[PDB]
Amino acid sequence: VGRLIYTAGGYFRQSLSYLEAYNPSNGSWLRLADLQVPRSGLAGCVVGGLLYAVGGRNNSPDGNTDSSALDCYNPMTNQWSPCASMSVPRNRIGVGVIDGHIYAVGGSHGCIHHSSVERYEPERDEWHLVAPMLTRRIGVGVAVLNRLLYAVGGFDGTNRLNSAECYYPERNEWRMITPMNTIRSGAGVCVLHNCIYAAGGYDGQDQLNSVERYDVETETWTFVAPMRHHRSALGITVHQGKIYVLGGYDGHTFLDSVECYDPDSDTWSEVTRMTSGRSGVGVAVTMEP
Ligand SMILES: O=S(=O)(Nc1cccc(-n2ncc(-c3nn[nH]n3)c2C2CC2)c1)c1ccccc1
Numbered sequence: 001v002g003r004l005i006y007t008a009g010g011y012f013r014q015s016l017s018y019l020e021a022y023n024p025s026n027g028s029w030l031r032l033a034d035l036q037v038p039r040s041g042l043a044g045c046v047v048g049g050l051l052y053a054v055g056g057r058n059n060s061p062d063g064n065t066d067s068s069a070l071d072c073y074n075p076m077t078n079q080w081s082p083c084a085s086m087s088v089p090r091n092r093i094g095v096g097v098i099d100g101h102i103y104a105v106g107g108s109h110g111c112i113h114h115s116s117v118e119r120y121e122p123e124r125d126e127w128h129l130v131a132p133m134l135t136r137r138i139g140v141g142v143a144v145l146n147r148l149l150y151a152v153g154g155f156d157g158t159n160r161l162n163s164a165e166c167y168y169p170e171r172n173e174w175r176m177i178t179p180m181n182t183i184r185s186g187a188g189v190c191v192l193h194n195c196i197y198a199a200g201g202y203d204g205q206d207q208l209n210s211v212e213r214y215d216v217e218t219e220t221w222t223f224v225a226p227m228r229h230h231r232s233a234l235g236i237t238v239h240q241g242k243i244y245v246l247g248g249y250d251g252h253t254f255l256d257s258v259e260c261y262d263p264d265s266d267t268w269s270e271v272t273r274m275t276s277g278r279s280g281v282g283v284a285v286t287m288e289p
Pocket residue numbers: 010011040041042092138139140154155160185186202204232233249279280281
């Protein structure tokens with residue numbers, strides 16, 4: 001009990017510093033301490049009950065600055081603290097956690113599209129590079145299942161991608177997996193039960209509402225019910241056996257919609273609205289502050 005869905009940063013007109021937390025048990029939102037630097041295109045994750053904001057870009061009137069930053073929010077104090085920075089700025093990043101370590105995957109720095117990957121050790125406050133992906137990927141969806149790290153879709157600088165790959169830590173090696181049925185860049189990717197879900201994204205022409213899942217045993221991708229709203233640059237997380245998608249861009253509006261997927265019924269429902277529409281947030285779940 002006592003866990004909230006935290007949304008950090010995002011974009012509406014400019015990059016945002018908001019940190020807000022939604023309580024599924026009572027529908028409430030809390031506004032918490034702002035990020036030190038506004039950022040969109042970041043990712044969130046949690047290790048040891050602390051929330052981390054990783055990478056992104058500050059789109060502002062004074063300029064556009066890609067972020068190498070790692071910042072840590074402690075719900076007990078409602079304070080952000082800087083951590084060691086990554087080796088390189090990474091906007092439109094994906095992150096995943098394996099055994100207490102944060103993997104930062106891909107992303108962009110100006111016109112550079114990264115294949116590089118680095119791993120953070122909270123106990124030592126150090127980053128180190130690991131093997132790079134087989135493909136350069138920005139807007140990459142990342143998730144961890146059974147202590148394996150998946151990188152899904154994205155944009156390589158020329159093509160939006162349906163391809164996906166998996167990192168096997170004990171071999172420090174990436175291998176391609178079955179490609180998705182749909183090209184998706186800037187999708188939401190998460191794990192639920194024994195599958196990697198990819199929701200929404202942009203296929204080069206349209207924002208998507210379709211959702212597909214990769215069963216890691218059978219190596220197949222299967223479509224599930226589509227979301228009510230097409231969305232790119234959505235936030236995504238899992239909480240108590242359901243997927244939550246937050247915001248994004250539908251080609252017309254920066255959405256405030258939050259939808260929730262129930263895998264038992266294979267249905268999506270609208271569960272709340274963010275306090276304002278935005279895209280490009282980072283999202284994770286930890287204890288209330
Ligand atoms: O400020 S945003 O939130 N930035 C952002 C954040 C997270 C991921 C991505 N992302 N990553 C690769 C691509 C991409 N692939 N092919 N074309 N585009 C994108 C874009 C399409 C969503 C972008 C922002 C979003 C939508 C409209 C205006 C601003």
